[PDB]
Every structure is written in structure tokens, then in C-alpha cells.
């Protein structure tokens, strides 16, 4: 249950137990939301540049529900999670993809890694949204801080690369401090 392990990369998992319950915690950008009748998937990524050719949703957190009761709470959580970050939700399924193309949505997640027969799934225990300004400040253990530096380094990797769809200059936010922080210590080193 509760003596938690930091995860710097979803690749760590392929080296994990194979039959256990490991309380985990990672830092990533919320990149996708899917609420269906059956389930609700939250996709996160730090954009490690695997090869690529795919980084978008490298952590997929499962919000399992069974009834009218629990789906309410699922929707309320999604609603509150989008509101925090400024994401337009419907009124009263949700398909949201490549959220990072419009909005840098840094999140700090506590989840439960459960494995059975080599296979594993992550169950959400907590998501702590981080404000971009609070993130930028935080770059001016340091596991969280190192992951954020990593993630922003990877976001400069993707932006100057004229092939990938993500552009800083194409974000919605959009704080004048962003252009500064990007041009600053990061995309000069």
C-alpha cells in the first residue's frame, strides 16, 4: 500500500516485480482524457524521445468505476481536473487528445502499480496539478524538479524540431514569461 517509489520513466516498470502492488509516483504532462460508459483513461507523458515515434501517452492511469454512483465521481474528478488547467469540457463521454499541443499541464501523480502474469496496470490514488508559473519558478530530493527540467528539455527537443506538431509559439496559455523562460537558461545551454 503505502511506502512510495518515485518513477522517473515509465520504462522503469518493465523492470518491476511482475506480481506485486508498488505505490508509485511520477511527474508528467497530462496529454489525454477518455471518459466512457465503461472506463476513464488519463494519459500522461514526459516525452523521453524513445526513437521516437510515440511519446504522447506513456503513462496510462485507470479510473475504474462500476456503477451510476462511481461514474459521477469519475466525471466530477475529470471536470475538476480540466477546470484547474483551463480545459473546455462539455455540459451534462469526453475525448481529449494531445492536450500538450494547446496546454502544458504538469501533474504530480500518486498511483498504484499492480502486476499479475508479467502484465501491469496503474490505478490513480492522487493527482496534484502543478501551475505552469509554479513550475517555471521551481526552475529558477529534487526528483520532482529533475523531472520538470527533463520534461522542459524534451519540450525544447520537440519544438525546434520542425517535424513534431508541438510548438511553444502555438500554445494557448499564454504567459509572456513562457517565451522568456524558454529562450532563457534552457534553450541556450
Residues that bind a second copy (CB under 8 A): 2, 63-67, 69-70, 72-77, 79-81, 83-84, 92, 110, 123-129
The Cα-based distances of 8 to 11, 88, 110, 169, 186 in angstroms read 8, 30, 13, 27, 20
- Cβ 187 to a second copy, closest distance in Å? 30
Output 31 or 107, the one with its CB closest to a second copy: 107
CA dist., res. 154 & res. 59, Å (int): 16
Is 157 in contact with 167 (CB distance < 8 Å)?
no
Output 16 or 84, the one with its CB closest to a second copy: 84
Output 134 or 146, the one with its CB closest to a second copy: 134
Output 90 or 118, the one with its CB closest to a second copy: 90
Output 29 or 81, the one with its CB closest to a second copy: 81
- Cβ 85 to a second copy, closest distance in Å? 11
CA dist., res. 10 & res. 85, Å (int): 23
CA dist., res. 1 & res. 112, Å (int): 8
- Cβ 107 to a second copy, closest distance in Å? 11
Q: What are phi and psi of 188, to 5 degrees?
A: -135, -35
- Cβ 150 to a second copy, closest distance in Å? 24
- Cβ 74 to a second copy, closest distance in Å? 6
8 burial type by CB count under 10 A (0-12 exposed, 13-18 middle, 19+ buried): middle
Q: What are phi and psi of 135, to 5 degrees?
A: -75, -45
Output 44 or 65, the one with its CB closest to a second copy: 65
The dihedral over CA atoms of 170, 88, 55, 177, expressed in degrees to the nearest 10, equals 40
- Cβ 80 to a second copy, closest distance in Å? 4
Amino acid at each position: 500500500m503505502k511506502n512510495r517509489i518515485f518513477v522517473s520513466s515509465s520504462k522503469d516498470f518493465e523492470g518491476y516485480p511482475s506480481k506485486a502492488i508498488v505505490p508509485v509516483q511520477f511527474v508528467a504532462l497530462l496529454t489525454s482524457i477518455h471518459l466512457t460508459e465503461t472506463k476513464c483513461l488519463l494519459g500522461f507523458s514526459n516525452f523521453e524521445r524513445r526513437g521516437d515515434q510515440s511519446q504522447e501517452d506513456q503513462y496510462l492511469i485507470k479510473l475504474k468505476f462500476k456503477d451510476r454512483g462511481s461514474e459521477r465521481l469519475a466525471r466530477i474528478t475529470i471536470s475538476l481536473l480540466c477546470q484547474y488547467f483551463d480545459i473546455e469540457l462539455p455540459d451534462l463521454t469526453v475525448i481529449l487528445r494531445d492536450i500538450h499541443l494547446e496546454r502544458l499541464c504538469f501533474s504530480s501523480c500518486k498511483a498504484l502499480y499492480v502486476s499479475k502474469h508479467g502484465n501491469y496496470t496503474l490505478f490513480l490514488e492522487d493527482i496534484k496539478p502543478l501551475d505552469l508559473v509554479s513550475v517555471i519558478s521551481t526552475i529558477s530530493e529534487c526528483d520532482l524538479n529533475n523531472s520538470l527540467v527533463d520534461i522542459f528539455n524534451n519540450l525544447i527537443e520537440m519544438n525546434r524540431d520542425e517535424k513534431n506538431r508541438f510548438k511553444f509559439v502555438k500554445l494557448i496559455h499564454y504567459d509572456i514569461e513562457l517565451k522568456k523562460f524558454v529562450q532563457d537558461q534552457q534553450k541556450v545551454l
